[PDB]
């Protein structure tokens, strides 16, 4: 809503309790030999293409 | 109990069964 970057940054970290990691990072974290494992079905079933 | 829920998430909850 306004063009100034510092207060944009400070409005994101203001003692943040919950820091949810993006799902893409959760995909690229684990290697292949458990990405096929059925424990990661919650990541697998949204990998379609 | 939340740690228990994490453990039950990260593993599974004829076929020739095998103990370890």
């Amino acid at each position: 809503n306004h063009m100034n970057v510092l207060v944009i940054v400070d409005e994101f970290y203001d003692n943040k309790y919950a820091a949810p990691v993006t799902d893409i990072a959760l995909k690229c974290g684990l290697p292949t030999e458990d990405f096929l494992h059925p424990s990661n079905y919650d990541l697998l079933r949204l990998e379609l293409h | 109990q939340q740690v228990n829920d994490y453990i039950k998430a990260k593993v599974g909850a004829q076929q020739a069964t095998c103990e370890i």
Binding site: H2, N4, L6, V7 | -
Partner: protein
């Protein structure tokens, strides 16, 4: 909204040095219903603008020709 915090910058340059030619071209700034702190920061910004302006002129006036054709006799 806000800015960076101000850096230290100890002293007042116009308090100590009256011998630069930039002094009468500084004094025209005066407060009008303004607290003296932000008015002083306005003086500081005008002073740094003037010294940048003066050193800019000092650069461009010595670099039209740093050599010249006319100095061959002397």
């Amino acid at each position: 909204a806000r800015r960076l915090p101000k850096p230290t910058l100890q002293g007042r340059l116009e308090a100590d040095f009256p011998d630069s030619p930039l002094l009468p071209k500084f004094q025209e700034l005066n407060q009008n219903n303004l607290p003296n702190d932000v008015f002083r920061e306005a003086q500081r910004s005008y002073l740094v603008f003037l010294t940048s302006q003066f050193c800019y002129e000092e650069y461009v006036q010595r670099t039209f020709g740093v050599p010249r054709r006319q100095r061959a006799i002397d």
